[PDB]
Every structure is written in C-alpha cells, then in structure tokens.
Amino acid sequence: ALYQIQLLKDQRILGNLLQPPNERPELPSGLYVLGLTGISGSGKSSVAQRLKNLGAYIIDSDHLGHRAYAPGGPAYQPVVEAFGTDILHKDGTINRKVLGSRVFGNKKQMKILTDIVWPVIAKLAREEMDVAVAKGKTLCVIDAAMLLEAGWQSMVHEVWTVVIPETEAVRRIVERDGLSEAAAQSRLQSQMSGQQLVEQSNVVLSTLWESHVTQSQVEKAWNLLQKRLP
C-alpha cells in the first residue's frame, strides 16, 4: 500500500500526538476537551467543520464573543463603558466595524477589550461544556484564535494547532479579507508565530495541501485520538 504523510521540520508528523495530554481535574468527568487554534489564514474553521462532521461538539469562541457583548450579555455594559456609546449602532448593538477600528493594530486598546471579554468567553465556554455533557456529549473542541495568548490551555486536555507557511497566510488574509499586506502582517505580528503555536501543541495539522489531504490528516488525527481517549 502506497501513501503519503505530512511533516513539519526546522521531525513532527501531522496528526500524531507530539507531547502528553494535560490532566484536567476541574473539567466534567465524562468529557475530553481539545483546544483548536492556529494563525490567521490557517483555515482552522475548515478543520473545525471536519471535526464537527466526525461528531465533535464545537464551541466557536468568536461567536461566543459576539454574544458576550450583545445587549443582555455579560460583557455589554463593561465594553460600552470602556469604549463609549460611539461604538453602538442605532439599535444599541455594538458596531463591530467601529470597535474593530479602535482595537485592530492597537495593542493597548485591544488589551482593554480582551481584559474584559476573554474571561467572559472562558466562563461561557465552561458553561456550554457543562450543558453538552448533560446532553450526552463526550468530546468538545474550543475553537479559539488566541487560545494560548488567553491562557486557555488550562481548560483543555490537548492543544491542536492548524499551521501554514506565513507567505500563504498573508496571501489568504490579503485576498480573502481585502486587507492591505501591511494590515495582514500587522494581524500576524499581533499573535503567536506558527512555531510558537507548534511548540506548545499536542497535535499539529495543516491546510497547506488540497482539501482531500486535509481530510486525510484530520481523519488520521481523529482515529489516533479515539484510541487514546479514557
């Protein structure tokens, strides 16, 4: 039988367990948790969807964030206090285009925001996992761009990172988001490098190759995971 495997060098086999999982006494007893992260342009949402198709319960942190500071949500009042009512649409919802203009590319302002929002999202993620476990789910994935920067590896058994070369990342960002190349590198500089992410990962994946190769990696990763679940 002839086949190909995917590797990262400076060897790490993509899909394999690279270092031991974390012990997590505080998580619900029936539940295994993956933290899924990657650099912008990594295509990690494609990977999250493939894990969803295999049966994982996905918690999308970006969405939880938007709900956290929806009117009625725990972060609404603090975010509006911290940034002012000029960030609000006419209907009183946060205008994320205006908020983004305040914080993107701006280290101090983004920190005012994430100091408020990240703890709120982490709490909402913990709540969602509890509900999922009550409804019989046994494997949860917290999909988060800034997982390691937020310290959220404390909430997961395994960190899974989706990586691609920085040149392809910048290309995907510039093209798909209509960013200037400087805005794209600004985005990338404002987060951990692929190598930093890899070093702190239990499993590494890549969307560098065509879609069928990504699927194969994810299936291989999923199968190995299943055999090491408690």
* Residue list, annotated binding site for ATP: 38-45
How far is 60 from 144, CA to CA, in rounded Å?
7
Smallest gap from Cβ 11 to ligand ACO, in A, equals 28
Instruction: Give me the residues paired with residue 94 across strands.
Output: 88
> In residues, how long is the chain?
230
Tell me the per-residue interface mask from 68 to 107 with ligand ACO, x by CB under 6 A, - otherwise.
----------------------------x--xx--x----
CB of 202 within 8 A of CB of 21? yes
Q: Which of 47, 56, 57, 61 binds ligand ACO (CB under 6 A)?
A: 61
Could you tell me the smallest distance in angstroms from the CB atom of residue 118 to ligand ACO?
A: 5
Quick check: 145 binds ligand ACO (CB under 6 A)?
Answer: yes
The footprint of ligand ACO on residues 148-207 (CB under 6 A) is 150, 190-191
CA distance 214 to 208: 8
Both structure tokens of 159: 């960190």
User: For residue 202, which of 186, 224, 184, 180 has the smallest C-alpha distance?
Assistant: 224
CA-wise closest residue to 104 among 223, 187, 209 = 187
Which of residues 16, 22, 40, 93 is near ligand ACO by CB under 6 A? 40
Contact residues: ligand ACO, CB under 6 A: 40, 61-62, 65, 96, 99-100, 103, 110, 113-114, 117-118, 121, 144-147, 150, 190-191
